[PDB]
Design a protein around this ligand. Sequence first.
Ligand SMILES: NC(=O)c1ccc[n+]([C@@H]2O[C@H](COP(=O)([O-])OP(=O)(O)OC[C@H]3O[C@@H](n4cnc5c(N)ncnc54)[C@H](OP(=O)(O)O)[C@@H]3O)[C@@H](O)[C@H]2O)c1
Ligand SMILES: O=C(O)COc1cc(F)ccc1C(=O)NCc1cccc(C(=O)O)c1
Length: 316
Amino acid sequence: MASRILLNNGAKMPILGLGTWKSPPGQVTEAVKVAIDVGYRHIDCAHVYQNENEVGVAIQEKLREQVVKREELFIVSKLWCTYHEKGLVKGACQKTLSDLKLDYLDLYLIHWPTGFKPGKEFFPLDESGNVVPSDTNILDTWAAMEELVDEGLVKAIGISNFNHLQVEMILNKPGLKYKPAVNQIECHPYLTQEKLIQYCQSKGIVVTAYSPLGSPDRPWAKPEDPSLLEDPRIKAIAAKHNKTTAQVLIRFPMQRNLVVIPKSVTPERIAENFKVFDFELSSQDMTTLLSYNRNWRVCALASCTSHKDYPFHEEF
Ligand SMILES: NC(=O)c1ccc[n+]([C@@H]2O[C@H](COP(=O)([O-])OP(=O)(O)OC[C@H]3O[C@@H](n4cnc5c(N)ncnc54)[C@H](OP(=O)(O)O)[C@@H]3O)[C@@H](O)[C@H]2O)c1
Ligand SMILES: O=C(O)COc1cc(F)ccc1C(=O)NCc1cccc(C(=O)O)c1
């Protein structure tokens, strides 16, 4: 299938990218270098991941080496929750640009719909452990994102972890200038997201699937938890196709017209995970994988469940 999907800003986005959350700073430069060498052209980043400087070293070295041209790369980052105030958005974007050593981002996302009190701490807490919210709402943060397009800092803007009513709020914003291009959400066979995906796709918003392998390195994992990579039913589909379980888990969202961003710092897995353009899952395979949904989430924080904009109380 085609390697890129057309966004509603007129640009094309590679359907496979490299994730960087949890990639150690002493390993991520080589991970990104290897990824670019083996064909990746989309890197998913964020300020909160604390490794954008090291990602940037890799990007700059591959541009200097002329392995790739800047126009061939698709670099994504995200505005952290403590920067939702309109007066902080530009500086947050500029810090990311400085660290990544770029003069524009291809896509900049509101990382979560929940704004937090500005300051040095990424999760500012009250004395009882609740996150301290900001009063800035999503619509004003969206207007600040639109300014970044008009200043040339970013080519596209979007959202992440927004539920369908929050997407709808953006789409219904008085005076909306640019629609979200992307909603980046958790999606895999245990959290298949049919309802939210259909809503976003019906509005022309491209969905990116995060944690497609079930994030086995997430810091809050428990030994009892479900494991996609070890599920014998998924292993059987992979064996039938002479592919790895990870390759099936990556191809699955691709065939739903999603973008997918598996993370690895292991050179052999970075290369393996890209070898997903040479086989097809059948419709029956796809429906079987969808049947494994259990509404299980890698990403959600008990500390934010009382925030007015917490996204996961709604069904979708
Ligand atoms: N927008 C958001 O709120 C949000 C939230 C979560 C994630 N994300 C993005 O999505 C990316 C991907 O999600 P994720 O990092 O949570 O997890 P993931 O991509 O589902 O899983 C990553 C884990 O799988 C392992 N792995 C990778 N390829 C493998 C293979 N072929 N065989 C076996 N194990 C393999 C990695 O190990 P090694 O690295 O040791 O090889 C790592 O432990 C993130 O890095 C981030 O960029 C965004
Ligand atoms: O967020 C990602 O991309 C990956 O997870 C992280 C990565 C980090 F470097 C540091 C913290 C996290 C994290 O705890 N996220 C979950 C999160 C964040 C903000 C609000 C909510 C909420 O439930 O409202 C949930």
